[PDB]
Amino acid sequence: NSIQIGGLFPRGADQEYSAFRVGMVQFSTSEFRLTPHIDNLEVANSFAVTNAFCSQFSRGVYAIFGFYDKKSVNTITSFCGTLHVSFITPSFPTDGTHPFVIQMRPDLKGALLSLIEYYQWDKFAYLYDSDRGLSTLQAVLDSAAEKKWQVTAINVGNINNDKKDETYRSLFQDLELKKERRVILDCERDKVNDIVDQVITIGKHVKGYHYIIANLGFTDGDLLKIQFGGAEVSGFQIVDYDDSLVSKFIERWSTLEEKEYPGAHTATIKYTSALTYDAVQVMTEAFRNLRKQRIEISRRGNAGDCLANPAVPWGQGVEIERALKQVQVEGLSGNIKFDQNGKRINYTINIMELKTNGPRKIGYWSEVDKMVLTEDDTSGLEQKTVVVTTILESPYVMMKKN
Amino acid sequence: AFCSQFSRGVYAIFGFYDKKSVNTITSFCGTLHVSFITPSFPTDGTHPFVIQMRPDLKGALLSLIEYYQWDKFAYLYDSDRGLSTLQAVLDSAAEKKWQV
Amino acid sequence: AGDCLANPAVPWGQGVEIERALKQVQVEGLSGNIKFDQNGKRINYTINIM
Ligand SMILES: *[C@@H]1O[C@H](CO)[C@@H](O)[C@H](O)[C@H]1NC(C)=O
Ligand SMILES: *[C@@H]1O[C@H](CO)[C@@H](O)[C@H](O)[C@H]1NC(C)=O
């Protein structure tokens, strides 16, 4: 009845763990129950990730739910590829087809490339952060030569937080040499709130500018500060709060005590945490299908040292790979399904434009269909003051005597 | 393999690393204080206990593109070798008016 | 030395003295002048342009 799994959590991911505990209760049946082993470690320090993964492998788990950084993603994917241990993660998908990895996050590269094609953009900025892999930068650069775009890629990541006022004021001075009015922000939801505040300081948020937040949590970050400046701000949202499924989840979420569940007494939830809740439903339904298929998975004994040479992989991991990669359930991230590689398939990302009345569901895409929502007859603002410019020269435009 | 040498008790490790495996060595040697001496491409950032024989080529490439007075050119790169240098010429493409 | 996944991480003392000796080496070789900074990157080096 006790199924052992390993948890690798970043120390600063409290809400991302609060959603994990809630998922344990919602999908707990009387047939069995999952037993987590949680290790809070530094996600960037890959030696700690190596020390943590091998801790769970010595305790003999069956799957591992965790995260990884750019500095540590290869450590996870290469151990799981040899030891045939299944890894479930909400971090960015691995740049390639790696077995025994269950990537809960969908691939955003297909979204951004067509949101650009929708607005008919041919020259824009792209401030990226390498903390989540250079997968998307190679996407915009490869398609920049095919469509003959004129793109400026700036590794805004490696910047110190003490000289941030003088350097951020210096980045926009370079972008002014082409008078760039179309920017794509590709940082995590933290550094975006840093750039957003520095955009307001220099006033580059009025009529004319048009930003595109490139992460799956447009509503997660704060938008009310660049809402009324007049700049059009697009984005992407994966947690559709309109669905009655999420609204059922949000209602129970908004009421839990914040001391036992940090970062949980609000009406919204970050796309990282929401994917975590939807991960438990993947794992629970994966083992339940092993039961119904009459498959025996419990370890024959001690897995031994992960550094065993030659590395002997336990065979039942393949059945766990095929069990997790063949789950198909419905959760907060909409539809959930995986291919033979563990990548998100058959999914749906909603597109969001920020207007005067707040975030507005405008569009959506799919790995088969691109930019289909037409249209948003509901909501609407019906408020548009057209800006007309002219020059003071008689008698065309003269200031009245009074 | 880094552990097969620590058990044997080496006092320093000469080797190489890839784009995918560089972070494994940099953080391992950082915690276990083993000294790594390698020619493999220099660490993107300051990682202690690593000796890079490879001199920083990216600083030399920028100076060369200036002397030739280029404005628009193609840059070919393989994601296998990496792109720490292509990143360097894409960051400096706005200040110095390059259409890469 | 034992295992590399030693918990807690026991860092031997003489490793920090080895790091200091390496970067303090200043000799001449096939690459030109070889001296290092406190991080381990080449300084006072020479790249020919051909
Ligand atoms: C794809 O998603 C649709 C909509 O949820 C679902 O009805 C269908 O069964 C899925 N197809 C496959 C092959 O999983
Ligand atoms: C710097 O390199 C030159 C060329 O090899 C050498 O003559 C000089 O002594 C070096 N500087 C120092 C401080 O050793």
Beta fraction of the residues of chain A?
15-25%
Inertia-based shape of chain A: elongated
**Order of the strands making up the biggest sheet of chain A:** 7-6-8-9-10-13-14
Please, what is the CATH homologous superfamily of the domain at 108-248 and 349-366 in chain A?
A: Response regulator
- Quaternary status: part of a larger assembly
- State the CATH architecture of the domain at 108-248 and 349-366 in chain A: 3-Layer(aba) Sandwich
Order of helices and strands of chain A: EHEHEHEEHEHEHEHEEHHHEEEE
List the topology elements:
The structure is cut from a larger assembly and holds three copies of chain A.
Chain A: E1 2-10, H1 14-26, E2 33-41, H2 46-59, E3 63-66, H3 73-82, E4 86-89, E5 101-103, H4 109-119, E6 123-128, H5 135-146, E7 150-155, H6 164-175, E8 182-186, H7 189-201, E9 210-213, E10 232-237, H8 244-253, H9 271-292, H10 316-324, E11 330-331, E12 334-335, E13 349-355, E14 358-365
Parallel strand pairs in A: 1-2, 1-3, 3-4, 4-5, 6-7, 6-8, 8-9, 9-10
Antiparallel strand pairs in A: 10-13, 11-12, 13-14
Helix pairs in contact in A: 1-9, 2-3, 9-10
PDB class: transport protein/inhibitor
Keywords: Transporter, membrane protein, transport protein, TRANSPORT PROTEIN-INHIBITOR complex
Entry title: AMPA subtype ionotropic glutamate receptor GluA2 in complex with noncompetitive inhibitor GYKI53655
